[PDB]
Amino acid sequence: VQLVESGGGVVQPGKSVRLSCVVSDFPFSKYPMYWVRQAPGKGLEWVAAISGDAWHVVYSNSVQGRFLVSRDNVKNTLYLEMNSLKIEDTAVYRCARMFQESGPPRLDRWSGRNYYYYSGMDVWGQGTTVTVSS
């Protein structure tokens, strides 16, 4: 369905904004989400991922610790907050849904540790753009 973002634009280094991706119709708490970054004239870079219950969060190594993601399954929103901005972060951000459905976490019997399954993407939002310069 409908899948866009908001809050894009252009800021300075050292700044901090937060985007807002909003989904339309599918049950949002059922699915995990992602973030991808296409640099202009380059390929794609994976950014982040959230579990469906907003419990599991995995970041890329380059943007590790700087950014922030979150969910609101009632308001059907999707946030990518960012901190300590650098000029090479200037690219196209895209909000994207997992292709398959995901289940609840698994809890293997032999060790009391849950498991959140993660598979790839089908619906890319057209996405905003953030530029970091002077």
Place this chain on the structure above:
Amino acid sequence: IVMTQTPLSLSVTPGQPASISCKSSESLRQSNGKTSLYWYRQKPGQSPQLLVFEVSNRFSGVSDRFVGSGSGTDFTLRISRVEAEDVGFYYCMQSKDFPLTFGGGTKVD
């Protein structure tokens, strides 16, 4: 892990079959019984669209001439009778583990 591909440029005309392969460093076979390699296409100036999710199955709105195969390390996407609107790029995307990477995107003119 690392996963690149080849060839970068295939500037062609419609009417012939060809194929694009993506080469894997780490072998992919998850314990579910499937190999998490996802092939899809963007157009220039557009967010991409899913061609095939698995190397076996396809997606809705896909012509039948889009076939893919491969081993745990070799991976191949074949396009029979390459259609006129096959412009833009073709990214090979894997889903083994994190961070899940891509290819460069093979340009087809």
Place this chain on the structure above:
Amino acid sequence: AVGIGAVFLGFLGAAGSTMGAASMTLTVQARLLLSGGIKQLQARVLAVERYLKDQQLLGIWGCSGKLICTTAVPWNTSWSNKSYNQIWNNMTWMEWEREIDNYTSLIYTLIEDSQNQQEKNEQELLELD
């Protein structure tokens, strides 16, 4: 493409802990004791034949189906010179079953024929009234 940390406990996870911390952990070592070219089958019977024996000895002692239970057999201080709070707060189990290894046969005879045999002839004859 998965992974989270520990939640409850692990298998043999309390085996370096004290008794007072391992006593709340017994179920994980209780569940996975049974489930887990002929030489798989020869394992699949020994794993059964060990489970029945430990099940059987709990059955004789009036203590089947419970994880823990008490008896009326008195502890004999000749068996252990250890103080009480050292046992329940300082000693692990793996050390503890090297210390009472020799006395174990005396213990098991002095549960059945001592008490739970005797708690049936006393039990059956509490009728007639």
Place this chain on the structure above:
Amino acid sequence: FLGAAGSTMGAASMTLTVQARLLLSGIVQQQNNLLRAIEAQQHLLQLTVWGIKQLQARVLAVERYLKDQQLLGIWGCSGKLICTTAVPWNTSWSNKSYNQIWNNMTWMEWEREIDNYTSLIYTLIEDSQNQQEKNEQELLELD
């Protein structure tokens, strides 16, 4: 014994007064006559293809019986048929209401409703109740 597999959960508890339709009784009246010693009146006469398969058949009759007694044995519910526990039901497992589970539902569909969540319920009985009550019982014998 599967006579009410199309019945509803609010109604299948009526006929379950028979011992799960004498479930385990069909095994003992089988293994009294599975242990017909004609196998010992022959020593099978050889080792045959069937006796290889019977040996792999009796083991599964042994193991999968034990995995159902042990789990009933650990849950403080040894040998009974309908026992209650102390575990509170969490609505995150199923947001179905009360009567829809009982009056308006089969069994095998209800398996696929919580076959995901089943394993979490297994740990959340033992470590929540049957590990737990035994210590609190033993405290009530300390006095």
Place this chain on the structure above:
Amino acid sequence: AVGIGAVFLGFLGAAGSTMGAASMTLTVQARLLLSGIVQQQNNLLRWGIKLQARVLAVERYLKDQQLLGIWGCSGKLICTTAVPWNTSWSNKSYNQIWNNMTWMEWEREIDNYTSLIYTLIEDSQNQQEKNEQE
């Protein structure tokens, strides 16, 4: 190595006792029915026959525990009932046998009636008391 005499009545020891006397060795007989002392000291170095005898011994064991489970008497060794005796089985009275006779002879008085006892214990003690649960 020396060894003093037994003070705990070893295997099959009270076979000459009366029925009121041999009941104190019921625990020793039950324990060693299963596998005996463990033979086969892990010497797997070099069949089929071996393991049929090992599998039967479990089935002899599991026959009885299930049968005590139907008889409402799992775990115990000595348990009562609600079934009165029928003297057509054997009208031999109380102390005619109890403080007078071993167990081999009491079995040779009731062997013809054996399966007849088993249905009555099944029905009128637990199939009966299933209709008292409510």
Place this chain on the structure above:
Amino acid sequence: AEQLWVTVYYGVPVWKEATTTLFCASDARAYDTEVHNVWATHACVPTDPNPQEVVLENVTENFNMWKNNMVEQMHEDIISLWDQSLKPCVKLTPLCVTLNCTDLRNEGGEIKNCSFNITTSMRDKVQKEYALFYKLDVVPIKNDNTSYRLISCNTSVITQACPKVSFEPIPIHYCAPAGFAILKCNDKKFNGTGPCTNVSTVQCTHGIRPVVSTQLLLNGSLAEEEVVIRSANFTDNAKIIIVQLNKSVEINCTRPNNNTRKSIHIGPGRAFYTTGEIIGDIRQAHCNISGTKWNDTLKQIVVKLKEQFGNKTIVFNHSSGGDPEIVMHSFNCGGEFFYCNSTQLFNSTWNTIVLPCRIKQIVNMWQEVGKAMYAPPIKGQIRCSSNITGLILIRDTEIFRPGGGDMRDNWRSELYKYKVVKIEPLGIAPTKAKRRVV
């Protein structure tokens, strides 16, 4: 004071050491469709494990890499996997026939193709033939002019292996049955024996590729960024020096001879094969090692060879003793067997190499004397890149020579961490409580 009474507990986490049976638990992908993988025996147990691991952090278990039983259960099973697979294939008893062998047109090697009369399955009339025969399998017999005979006739039987199967060493994960927890040391300073610090617990062991090679170890598994070398006494002379080096050394070995298919006479429903023609020009097979890194390697070894005595007198020497099967370096490569000369690899030190490889065909079983497998190759040339993560040395200015007569020592290098213990879940302890008595 108070009276104490004994209290029964169940599921108590203790153990003793036991010696039980482990079972194969291999890969389970591409075992179907002509993959008669003799290591997998068509994917022995199809698990494809999820090797989880629980840290214990308060547990010290006195390990020993030398009195371990798991290495003993491999050397039982591997020849046991051979023996069921060596059974249904073609026996080669009726072939020990006197020969007439002449020089082959394009060194001592393939010069002699031969000819002999045989009447295997028709059982009516004999017939001469032509084959291709190396050295290391023929004998010039007595009282005759240029007549040959196979070296291992008057041993036990000489059954070959079938061409359906593959000796491809896929990694095998040893899992543990119920009531047994395989343990593993978590200290990488673990010198081989003694205690460990925070031993964990795995369901199933890591990757073990059961490769077969003397004097080195090819597709092995390597430690962290120090070089670790272990031995039994490590002062005694006639022990084995297990070497674990922190980096890999890449190897190329190829067989440039375009060997082909062939059609040799039929047993009773049993087509036998003896290597078909070369394309017409012979290049002798050779290993081909990047000799800079190898030269870089052995000075890195005496860094960690040294620190147990003084700071003087380290050398490297080549091997010695007996027939070339124990002298020259042995390893397999994809259904093909190599004996390579490795004298060049062992020049002494102080505080692109090409090696002449030799190939035979009639190959002894690895430890038993008696029977012996056999395999003619498939068409084309052969290439296999590989690795090195270890070698086997002996003691003898202090002389180190490449020894080796047991790949259990290779499996000792693979299984230097593990220990299998049985659960004794039942246990008792006293307290103040007491059963209610009426």
Place this chain on the structure above:
Amino acid sequence: FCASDAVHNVWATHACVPTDPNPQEVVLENVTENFNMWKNNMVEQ
């Protein structure tokens, strides 16, 4: 099952289990029992 006390004898371990630690005996008090050595099966064993 046969138990033999304890190289490469056919009776050593390829037929039987290894060495016997100890034979035992419990003698019974008030017991009568028939016997036969011609209707026996150990001798057929």
